[PDB]
């Protein structure tokens with residue numbers, strides 16, 4: 774019933790120390806994007822709210838720049854950064870769409 | 881981090897009658913972007929701070945918005961039995977979820 778789909782930047786590799794762009798895109802729906810959250814299973818990274826702008830959560834402020842667009846740029850990568858990241862689009866009237874990216878930080 | 885959700889709890893109600901599902905978000909000053917009413921599988925309604933109520937079309941006959949941020953179900957059937965979720969999408973806090981289990985009865 775819900776027609777939106779999400780593309781993402783895929784399952785990726787960067788190396789210890791570097792940077793990476795996390796990005797998604799919502800296709801195939803005319804619904805309004807009211808907010809995008811970036812999260813892990815257990816943690817919030819950042820929110821773009823259509824009305825209010827970007828908020829980066831304090832534990833990531835140091836090493837995360839908003840954008841480009843609705844994406845996120847991770848800096849100073851460590852091994853601990855390995856795992857799943859999620860771009861969560863909150864929309865009206867369709868509701869929540871979620872894309873997934875797996876990151877692996879290399880030895 | 882700081883918010884908590886009260887709900888109307890776990891409920892029994894009678895085949896054919898009506899019920900109010902309600903949640904309240906406390907202990908956070910964060911702005912509520914919208915509140916989704918969902919089952920595990922499906923969206924029932926969204927109340928969005930800018931756009932107002934959307935009642936999802938397949939539920940329009942049996943779900944009336946309100947009171948406030950809650951939902952009223954009418955003409956319950958045994959299928960209506962299950963989990964309902966009130967999912968607050970907020971800035972800068974993120975998502976808080978309240979749970980309500982509905983068990984619908986004969987006699």
Ligand SMILES: [Cl-]
Pocket residue numbers: 822824825911912913929971
């Ligand atoms: Cl807002």
